[PDB]
């Protein structure tokens, strides 16, 4: 059936979100801001209420990188 | 560092 109607769908998206955050922050920790933010914006994109996530990010990211993030939001 | 990811997870 359509996405979301299967028990396994919620597990896949939680795993996807964790992966994307871990990958993004690893890439950021290497200096690859652009690809890191790509992954962070994928994580945000599957999150139904990303208010605190965005807040922490804007708190913690360099401001030109946060700007990049918004461009890719 | 890559465990920064735990902070982002805690935001939910």
UniProtKB/Swiss-Prot annotation, chain A:
<comment type="subunit">
    <text>Forms part of the preprotein translocase complex of the outer mitochondrial membrane (TOM complex) which consists of at least 7 different proteins (TOMM5, TOMM6, TOMM7, TOMM20, TOMM22, TOMM40 and TOMM70). Interacts with TOM22. Interacts with APEX1. Interacts with TBC1D21. Upon mitochondrial depolarization, interacts with PINK1; the interaction is required for PINK1-TOM-TIM23 supercomplex formation which is critical for PINK1 stabilization at the outer mitochondrial membrane, kinase activation and downstream mitophagy.</text>
</comment>
<comment type="similarity">
    <text>Belongs to the Tom20 family.</text>
</comment>
<feature type="cross-link" description="Glycyl lysine isopeptide (Lys-Gly) (interchain with G-Cter in ubiquitin)">
    <location>
        <position position="8"/>
    </location>
</feature>
<protein>
    <recommendedName>
        <fullName>Mitochondrial import receptor subunit TOM20 homolog</fullName>
    </recommendedName>
</protein>
<feature type="cross-link" description="Glycyl lysine isopeptide (Lys-Gly) (interchain with G-Cter in ubiquitin)">
    <location>
        <position position="15"/>
    </location>
</feature>
<comment type="function">
    <text>Central component of the receptor complex responsible for the recognition and translocation of cytosolically synthesized mitochondrial preproteins. Together with TOM22 functions as the transit peptide receptor at the surface of the mitochondrion outer membrane and facilitates the movement of preproteins into the TOM40 translocation pore. Required for the translocation across the mitochondrial outer membrane of cytochrome P450 monooxygenases.</text>
</comment>
